[PDB]
Amino acid sequence: IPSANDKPYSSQELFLRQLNHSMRTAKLGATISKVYYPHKDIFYPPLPENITVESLMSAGVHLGQ
RNA sequence: AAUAUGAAUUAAUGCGAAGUUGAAAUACAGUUACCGUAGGGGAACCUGCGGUGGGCUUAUAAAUAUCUUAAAUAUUCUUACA
Ligand SMILES: [K+]
Ligand SMILES: [K+]
Ligand SMILES: [K+]
Ligand SMILES: [Mg+2]
Ligand SMILES: [Mg+2]
Ligand SMILES: [Mg+2]
Ligand SMILES: [Mg+2]
Ligand SMILES: [Mg+2]
Ligand SMILES: [Mg+2]
Ligand SMILES: [Mg+2]
Known part of the structure; x- marks a missing residue:
């Protein structure tokens, strides 16, 4: 609901x-x-072919129990 | 002297039915049971001494908790940005 040009x-x-x-x-x-x-x-x-160790490490995949 | 036989005589035990006197054991079986040993008692059993668990591992709180941009910003995002 547009307002008046003065309001x-x-x-x-x-x-x-x-x-x-x-x-x-x-x-x-x-x-x-x-x-x-x-x-x-x-x-x-x-894509799976462009994945590196760095990328996996950046995601925390290396941190085990 | 041995072996075998019978043997006066005498000891232990099983099964069968079947009551009797108690109620010893199995539950905390109503006194924890059992092992060794000793003494005692109609009978199972009772009592002393040490041992064992094949009885107590069956074990389960004296509680107390904290500050940075709450959003025009995170929350949206579909191979995009870079
Ligand atoms: K007894
Ligand atoms: K005994
Ligand atoms: K005894
Ligand atoms: Mg009795
Ligand atoms: Mg009894
Ligand atoms: Mg008893
Ligand atoms: Mg006695
Ligand atoms: Mg005793
Ligand atoms: Mg028992
Ligand atoms: Mg037990």
Whole structure:
């Protein structure tokens, strides 16, 4: 329900105004490299041929009981 | 002297039925049982001394618990970013 052009933004409009900022501006200034994101293990798993000892070790697979 | 036989005479024991006097054992069996040994008692048994567990491992709380960006940021994310 858009608000009148004279009235201030509603709570819903502020949320959509923030979502617009999040897509464009919020990620300006730098990119992030070589940082582990937990979700990417599930959604971007590597292929078996590209797995290294380093990758297995980074995941903690070597830590037994 | 040995072997065999019978033997006066005399000792131990099994089974069978079948009651009698008690109630010793199996449960904490109503006094823990049993082993060795000694004494005593109608009968099982009772008592002393040490031993054994084939009886007590059957074992189960005097309680007290802590601070960093709660999110425009983690929570979403589908091979993308890099
Ligand atoms: K007895
Ligand atoms: K005895
Ligand atoms: K005795
Ligand atoms: Mg008696
Ligand atoms: Mg008795
Ligand atoms: Mg008894
Ligand atoms: Mg006596
Ligand atoms: Mg005794
Ligand atoms: Mg017993
Ligand atoms: Mg026992």
